[PDB]
Design a protein around this ligand. Structure first.
Ligand SMILES: Cc1cc2nc3c(=O)[nH]c(=O)nc-3n(C[C@H](O)[C@H](O)[C@H](O)COP(=O)(O)OP(=O)(O)OC[C@H]3O[C@@H](n4cnc5c(N)ncnc54)[C@H](O)[C@@H]3O)c2cc1C
Ligand SMILES: [Cl-]
Length: 635
């Protein structure tokens, strides 16, 4: 037993300083929230994990079942650096391996990693703490049970009042912190932030150090107009849906121990918009660093990781992570791509490429230059949705197919559900995930959701078409052959106000026309043949700002009456009015394969009142009431 590896230190300063592991056992909630300034090689996180795992082995019936860890790192290391430093701590080896298996690219923003079969949520915030904290969401307030105040020795950049004030704002009352320093200005900084502070002996030799406790909740400037309320009960949830996002939301809720039931109008899941054979998965970038791009940057990477974790657990679905090549086939598209390339992306996420480079990758002359997304690809969303639905079923979700909801009505603390004609059901909490049909309710009909038919053609491959290795995106898209069926998909029509799903010949020809029109300089696209008239049709739910809608279903009448006064006020203002115990997720447009997993996880986390994985503007930009709140916020 030495001190030289720094493991005993970590345990003394950060775990014991916050009352662990004793505190695991007395902890009164199902989850415990830790936050850390810095992350480094993960020493504090891995040590905590190890202890929390020993505690779960020893007390499988204790209240505490889950750990959430929030970390702020300005200088994210590469996974090889992580591996190299973890050689010092072989006793952490197996936790370390699971961590490194999911370590993300150095992209600015929040990256949520699900570890230990869902018992651990790791929110990695890559960016400067100081510029980050004022951007964070109200869902982080009053949440944190214990802080690991780590980093360089008070170098002074990090240890300002702005950090201490954010920390207290984010601390639950009774929540605590510990740090390795005892610098006077840090002590004074944490007191003025609102903590009680105690000075104690450092580990072994040097230093004194500091611990403390937040005696009272800091009521801090909120944004009540974009409030994200929890469900009061998660032991009785009914999902109305049956597409990709219903299954992901199911699973994200089951990880938290919710009980969920599915009602789906069709005989089978994935008979709506989620039913194609091959769909494209890549991020939507703009180079504007707005809410849209911020969301898609997190969403894409989060979706790839979840899809890989699922595949690792034995879930099966056709797919190739073959890369996506988006072509500058046009003045407009070239301009858009040019703007994206002004932000400096790691080439592991998005890379500018010449016509030659794209074609080299593609196996076919791509006719233009553009941008390449090497982790994008295609998946069979039909297989994926059936697979995730099956998994949710195996894990406890009962499924009632051919249950088209016709009437939804709150009565005496329950939602009464009338179908088309099976028995009426009633539930404490409901979630609407019905895609293009979302705004058909008296409760949802003032939400600006638009419905857009598309038709995707199914085409036989040929020796030349088989050569294609990437998804090609132009004004439309063409996937590589699915080697399991020897067919490709090429789409898609985009018909606003049109919800019929009948095969149309005109639209079948247009899927080929689009390709021929956008790559006129090459001849292989002539090998596309749509004359067997095989296609699939479906209907997207589009939103004019191109971002999903996820959250509580907002109450129009009360919102307008309650915020007529809002602009003058900006005071202590009431939270956004909503229908009680009613939530929604959808508005996925044409990018649901990319956006679905993160919105699902956002919705589950919200309904459980947990900290959310995005900043305030990006969450406000996903909130269902946003188009209204935007007006009222200016008059
Ligand atoms: C032509 C086309 C091309 C596409 N290409 C891509 C692509 O390249 N990449 C990509 O990521 N995505 C693509 N998409 C999919 C897009 O991402 C969709 O927005 C997404 O699949 C919708 O998923 P969802 O779960 O929200 O809704 P859906 O899959 O449409 O499911 C809605 C479900 O709700 C059920 N329902 C509706 N009303 C009721 C009711 N009253 N009672 C009970 N149940 C009800 C239905 O039974 C249905 O199962 C494409 C879609 C289309 C149509
Ligand atoms: Cl699809």
């Amino acid at each position: 037993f030495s001190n030289e590896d720094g493991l005993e230190e970590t345990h003394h300063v950060f775990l014991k300083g916050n009352g662990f592991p004793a505190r695991f056992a007395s902890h009164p909630q199902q989850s415990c929230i830790f936050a850390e300034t810095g992350f480094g090689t993960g020493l504090n996180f891995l040590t905590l994990w190890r202890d929390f795992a020993l505690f779960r082995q020893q007390s499988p019936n204790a209240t505490l079942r889950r750990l959430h860890y929030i970390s702020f790192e300005k200088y994210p290391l590469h996974v090889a650096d992580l591996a190299s430093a973890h050689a010092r701590w072989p006793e952490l080896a197996s936790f370390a391996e699971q961590l490194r298996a999911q370590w993300p690219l150095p992209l600015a923003g929040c990256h949520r990693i699900l570890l230990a079969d869902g018992a651990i949520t790791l929110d990695l915030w890559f960016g400067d703490v100081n510029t980050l904290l004022p951007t964070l969401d109200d869902s982080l307030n009053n949440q944190v049970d214990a802080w690991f105040l780590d980093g360089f020795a008070p170098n002074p950049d990090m240890w300002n009042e702005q950090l201490f004030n954010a920390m207290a704002r984010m601390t639950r009352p009774g929540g605590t912190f510990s740090t390795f320093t005892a610098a006077g200005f840090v002590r004074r900084g944490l007191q003025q932030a609102g903590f009680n502070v105690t000075k104690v002996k450092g580990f072994g030799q040097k230093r004194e150090m500091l611990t403390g406790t937040l005696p009272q909740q800091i009521h801090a400037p909120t944004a009540p107009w974009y409030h994200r309320p929890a469900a009061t009960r998660c032991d009785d949830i009914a999902i109305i849906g049956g597409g990709i996002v219903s299954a992901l939301t199911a699973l994200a809720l089951q990880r938290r121990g919710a009980v969920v039931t599915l009602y789906c109008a069709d005989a089978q899941p994935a008979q709506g918009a989620s039913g194609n054979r091959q769909g494209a998965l890549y991020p939507l970038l703009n180079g504007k660093n707005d809410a849209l791009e911020t969301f898609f940057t997190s969403a894409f990477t989060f979706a790839r990781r979840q899809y890989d974790q699922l595949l690792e657990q034995g879930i099966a679905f056709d797919h190739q992570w073959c890369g996506v090549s988006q072509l500058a086939f046009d003045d407009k598209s070239r301009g858009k791509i040019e703007k994206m390339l002004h932000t400096q992306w790691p080439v592991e996420f998005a890379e500018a490429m010449s016509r030659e480079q794209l074609s080299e990758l593609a196996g076919l002359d791509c006719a233009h230059d553009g941008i390449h997304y090497p982790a994008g690809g295609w998946l069979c969303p039909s297989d994926l949705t059936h697979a995730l639905m099956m998994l949710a079923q195996q894990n406890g979700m009962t499924c009632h197919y051919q249950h088209e909801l016709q009437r939804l009505k709150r009565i005496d603390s329950q939602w009464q559900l009338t179908f088309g004609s099976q028995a009426a059901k009633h539930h404490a909490t409901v979630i609407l995930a019905t895609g293009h049909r979302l705004p058909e309710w008296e409760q949802t009909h003032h939400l600006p959701l638009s419905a857009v038919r598309g038709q995707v053609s199914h085409i036989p491959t040929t020796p030349v078409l088989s050569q294609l290795q990437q998804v090609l995106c132009y004004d439309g898209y063409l996937t590589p052959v699915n080697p399991a069926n020897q067919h490709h998909c090429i789409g898609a029509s985009y018909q606003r106000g049109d919800i019929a799903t009948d095969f149309r010949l005109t639209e079948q020809q247009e899927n080929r026309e689009r390709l021929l029109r956008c790559l006129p300089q090459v001849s292989w696209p002539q090998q596309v043949d749509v004359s067997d008239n095989q296609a699939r049709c479906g209907v997207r739910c589009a939103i004019r700002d191109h971002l999903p809608m996820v959250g509580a279903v907002p109450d129009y009448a009360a919102t307008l009456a309650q915020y007529q006064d809002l602009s003058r006020r900006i005071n202590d203002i009431a939270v956004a009015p909503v229908w009680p115990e009613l939530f929604m997720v959808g508005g996925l447009g044409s990018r649901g394969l990319c956006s679905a997993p993160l919105v699902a996880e956002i919705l589950a986390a919200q309904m459980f009142g947990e900290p959310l994985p995005l900043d305030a503007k990006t969450l406000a930009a996903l909130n269902p009431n946003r188009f209204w709140i935007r007006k009222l916020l200016k008059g």
